[PDB]
Amino acid sequence: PLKVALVNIPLRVPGSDAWISVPPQGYGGIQWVVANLMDGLLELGHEVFLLGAPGSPAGRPGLTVVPAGEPEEIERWLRTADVDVVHDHSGGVIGPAGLPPGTAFISSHHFTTRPVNPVGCTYSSRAQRAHCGGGDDAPVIPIPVDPARYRSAADQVAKEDFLLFMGRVSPHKGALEAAAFAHACGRRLVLAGPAWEPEYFDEITRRYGSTVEPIGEVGGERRLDLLASAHAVLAMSQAVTGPWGGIWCEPGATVVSEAAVSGTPVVGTGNGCLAEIVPSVGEVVGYGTDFAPDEARRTLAGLPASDEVRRAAVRLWGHVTIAERYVEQYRRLLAGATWK
Description:
By secondary structure, the protein is an alpha/beta fold. Helices cover 34% and strands 14% of the residues. It has 2 domains: 1-142 and 319-335, Rossmann fold (3-Layer(aba) Sandwich), CATH 3.40.50; 143-318, Rossmann fold, CATH 3.40.50.2000. A 6-stranded parallel β-sheet has the order 3-2-1-4-5-6. A 6-stranded parallel β-sheet has the order 9-8-7-10-11-12, sandwiched between helices. It starts with a strand and ends in a 6-residue tail after the last helix. Residues 157-278 form the Glycosyl transferase family domain.
């Protein structure tokens, strides 16, 4: 049994001194990844020390929530920790230097940008690994999902007619293009996530007002019901640039595994990881806003049903399967092997 220090990305609740928890109260993809990962590791019998998320729920046996929020506190703690593995999800807020002898260092890269710590880095997709300059011996391990955290077939959530966009309402996430696709289909689009870019938000409401229903940041129980009740989820990441530098390349798209394990198929673009995961649970479409209604409406009406997408999601992305893939890499590192 391994002692695993899982380092969440340390971020404050917007406008607040509190740290975002794992799983998060509101918006936060990485924090969901760590929650689902953590459940896998604990189910496998490993001990988990969660860092960078103080105040997170702490009940699970095998789980210790470490009272270290900021980077310096996390580094201080790691220097004296008796753990076998430090598994970084922060994008390199911490690094291997200073860890006690014998401690393995591993990362899950969640960014379009090239990693701070390439050595011992894993990628959620081949497209990301390539884009980030990761070598062929770097593991590709997609985003996990724990079905227990999502609505099940037995919950019998009634299907609604609305399409669903769930993430930050930002151009590279393709909120506008999702409005266009919903419009093409004659459907409503719930825009569930933070819409902090006012000119962008305003353009969507101008062009597709009668289509879109913007509800703002969601979380908790409503988030889960939306995921389950939606007719389909639209993951429409666009190949555009921005303040990250270079072309946007969706690293792992947690919403894909989330929708499907909640029994909801996905329409997406082929951006980044989407080319790899969307076809398993729905259909890839083109970039831009120019969707022929006949095609769109057929794309939508031909998507897989709940049982199929849930099945696929558990087989490919199930928390225990993905956690055991990580443990295999932890042991690789512990035996003295390395990669970049």
